[PDB]
Amino acid sequence: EAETDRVTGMNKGISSIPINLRVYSPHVLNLTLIDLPGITPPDIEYQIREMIMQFITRENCLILAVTPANTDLANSDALKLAKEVDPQGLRTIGVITKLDLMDEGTDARDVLENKLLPLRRGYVGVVNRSQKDIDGKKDIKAAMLAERKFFLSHPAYRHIADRMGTPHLQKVLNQQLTNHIRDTLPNFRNKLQGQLLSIEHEVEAPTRKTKALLQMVQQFAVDFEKRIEGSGDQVDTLELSGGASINRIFHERFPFEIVKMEFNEKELRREISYAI
Amino acid sequence: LSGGASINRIFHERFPFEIVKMEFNEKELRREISYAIKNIHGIRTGLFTPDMAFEAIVKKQIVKLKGPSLKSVDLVIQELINTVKKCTKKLANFPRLCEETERIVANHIREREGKTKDQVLLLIDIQVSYINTNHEDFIGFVGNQVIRKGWLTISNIGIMKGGSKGYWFVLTAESLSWYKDDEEKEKKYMLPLDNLKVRDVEKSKHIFALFNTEQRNVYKDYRFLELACDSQEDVDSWKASLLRAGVYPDKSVFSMDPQLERQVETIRNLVDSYMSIINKCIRDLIPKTIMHLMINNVKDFINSELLAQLYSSEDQNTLMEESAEQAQRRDEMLRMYQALKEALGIIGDI
Amino acid sequence: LVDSYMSIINKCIRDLIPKTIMHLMINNVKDFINSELLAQLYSSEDQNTL
Secondary structure, X not given: OHHHHHHOOOOOOOXXXXXXXXXXXXXXXXXXXXXXXXXXXXXXXXXXXXXXXXXXXXXXXXXXXXXXXXXXXXXXXXXXXHXXXXXXXXXXXXXXXXXHHOOOOOOOHHHHOOOOOOOOOOEEEOOOOOOEOOOOOEOHHHHHHHHHHHHHHOOOOHHHHHHOOHHHHHHHHHHXXXXXXXXXXXXXXXHHHHHHHHHHXXXXXXXXXXXXXXXXXXXXXXXXXXXXXXXXXXXXXOOOOHHHHHHHHHHHHHXXXXXXXXXXXXXXXXXXXXXX | OOHHHHHHHHHHHHHHHHHHHOOOOHHHHHHHHHHHHHHHHEOEOOOOOOHHHHHHHHHHHHHOOHHHHHHHHHHHHHHHXXXXXXXXXXXXXXXXXXXXXXXXXXXXXXXXXXHHHHHHHHHHHHHHHOOOOOOOOOOOOOOOOOOEEEEEEEXXXXXXXXXXXXXXXXXXXXXXEEEOOOOOOOEEEEEEOOOEEEEEOOOOOEEEEEEEOOOOOOEOOEOOEEEEEOOHHHHHHHHHHHHHHOOOEOOOOOOOOHHHHHHXXXXXXXXXXXXXXXXXXXXXXXXXXXXXHHHHHHHHHHHHHHHHHHHHHOOHHHHOOOOHHHHHHHHHHHHHHHHHHHHHHHOOOO | OHHHHHHHHHHHHHHHHHHHHHHHHHHHXXXXXXXXXXXXXXXXXXXXXX
């Protein structure tokens, strides 16, 4: 909260500057995730979407799409943005929350079974059956047990219980991320090294001032001739050249400047008549 | 759909369409030109019209083909890398081999990626360096074979008195027909491609429409035919396919003395004309370049160098080693065999 | 049929090879003379002697 407020001017706005928190625990597997602003200034909705797109439009970015089961899954904001950048659903992993909150007599079996809104990486269900200890603080062991019981006792999900719940999700993410890195480690190192050596040629580049002067002045000279005469190549299309403006002075301004100073008929006639 | 057939679609349907899509914004372009002719002249005067202003504008346009052309190479790289991954599912039973094979081939692709892109760029650079005026096509002074088949939803039909149905559409160089299903046993209609154009309907569904420029209704009593797809890439693919069939998408979006307007009008016709010549060449030429430098090369590589690479990288003793999943099934089958033979051997029909 | 296709190829090639010669040689030689030439002359022989 403090680091966020430190950066964000208004206490409700967003920022692209990331916060990098690493947690070591016996309750977690080796896994990394980038949490982003949830979908919902006045243009905040667009700011959030724009931020999300910066991340998810990248090919190597895997999408963990979270949607609540007690809603219209076809209208899931997460699934909709995921379909926008990953139409083939090949880099999107679905997560279904709030399964215990579904309307009586309904269930998300068809989605959990990867049949309704098919994704190659599949769907995983979870439930937050919050348990508090004596002190009133989060009790994860009891919570994870309540979730296990829920899937095992649900007639629609019992057959899938071993592929549902919090512990399982971490394993899948751990596996897929590892495989994703293995696939990307050869191509990433090459694409970066190629763009790297090109920069090295520029970084490495007394004796150099004299040669620079000559080149700099000559550059200046051709630039000047270019504006003032329209010599090749391709001149300019955005702004009027020097020589062209001068041309306007010569053949539009000067004539007009003369005419404006020119003797008027009445004052011309009196002067001459006086002379005769 | 196969990999190689898709490549043909990339070359002769996608690439053209990607090109067509980059809007000229001509009104702002014409301004650029008029500014350009005044700048070549400038400090000099009048007749005749700046030869170099024409060249100036064209070189701008040709440079703009680097984007859609490089993208094309990637779209080919995508289908190529997809295909090696498809083929190697038949070798999945050997984890270290499929891995190492994928590795070496994927590697080779990225090496070829450089060289093909370089040549693609260079080819376009060559085009800007010299702008030939002696081309015969420059200076004034098909088959009914199926182009594409797919399911589409007609959204245009009224919510009342009509309905919504999915049809199996068949597009050819002459018509666009739709059937009840992919068996093509019942043809509901066949619509001629003559004088047809394409417009995109305003924004979970993506719709687009065909309309006849020369008459009111394009099919039957319905003004225009609205077609929809569940994904955005699909409508972009269909629009590209129609382009191949010759139905283009409709374009829709002074103080100066009369002599300049004439001067701008002449050069404008020239730029449009020359680009036509260039576009034709490049649409033809970039595929051939990709074909030769990437597709044909990778193909030949796999046949000859791949086996050699596999041998050098590691001993044949190591890479054909592990196969636990096959072994687990076979171990189950091996125990299966000894058991089933004894089982039936004791039992009898009696 | 062959005559037709060759016509198509010839037109592209007749058009394109000058462009290639232009870009790889003429434009290259030109650019060399303007920038690299003087430096090479300086590097080559003593300015007093040449």
